[PDB]
Amino acid sequence: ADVVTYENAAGNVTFDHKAHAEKLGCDACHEGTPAKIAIDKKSAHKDACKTCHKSNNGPTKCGGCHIK
Ligand code: HEC
Ligand code: HEC
Ligand code: HEC
Numbered sequence: 001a002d003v004v005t006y007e008n009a010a011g012n013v014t015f016d017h018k019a020h021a022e023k024l025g026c027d028a029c030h031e032g033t034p035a036k037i038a039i040d041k042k043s044a045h046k047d048a049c050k051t052c053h054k055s056n057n058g059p060t061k062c063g064g065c066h067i068k
Contacts, residue, residue, distance in 0.1 A: 001017035001018065001021075002017055002018050003015065003016055003017060003018055003019060004017055006039070008066070010062075010066050011062075011063070011065075011066025011067040011068050012066070012067045013044075013065055013066055013067070014067075028052070049065075053065075
């Protein structure tokens with residue numbers, strides 16, 4: 001799987017299916033069985049993606065995940 005890119009009115013968000021994985025190892029987003037995790041404007045803001053970002057030397061503010 002390759003760079004998907006979610007295009008949204010608040011800024012596109014770069015779903016790096018490859019580029020994150022190349023460092024992460026799939027596992028990081030996927031407990032053994034990878035599958036289509038539902039992402040939305042709660043999920044992506046509470047814990048999915050966020051909580052890794054919270055506990056990583058990476059961006060966390062809106063305009064550090066959304067393009068602007
Ligand atoms: C966390 C940021 C991810 C990384 C890195 C990988 N995947 Fe992923 N995957 C992620 C999400 C949020 C989703 C949902 C995509 C959507 O818009 O629905 C997925 C989905 C998959 C799927 C399911 C595809 C389907 O059958 O509908 C697969 C098979 C999958 N991801 C595989 C996969 C592998 C092998 C990864 C390492 C190369 C990998 N993902 C990384 C989130 C993330
Ligand atoms: C990545 C680490 C994110 C951070 C930080 C923020 N957002 Fe986000 N947002 C993210 C994703 C993966 C998505 C998926 C698309 C969807 O519609 O849910 C979103 C989406 C939004 C949207 C919806 C835009 C639309 O066209 O309706 C909004 C309004 C939004 N995000 C706002 C938002 C704000 C204000 C943030 C800082 C508090 C913010 N997001 C951070 C991923 C990420
Ligand atoms: C850890 C398990 C992560 C998950 C889950 C997600 N991301 Fe991530 N992201 C992570 C790291 C360690 C980094 C690199 C930080 C650095 O500065 O080296 C990132 C980076 C991003 C970026 C920045 C690149 C860009 O396109 O500008 C974005 C936008 C980003 N991450 C988005 C993102 C989204 C939307 C996620 C799920 C839908 C997501 N990340 C998950 C670590 C992890």
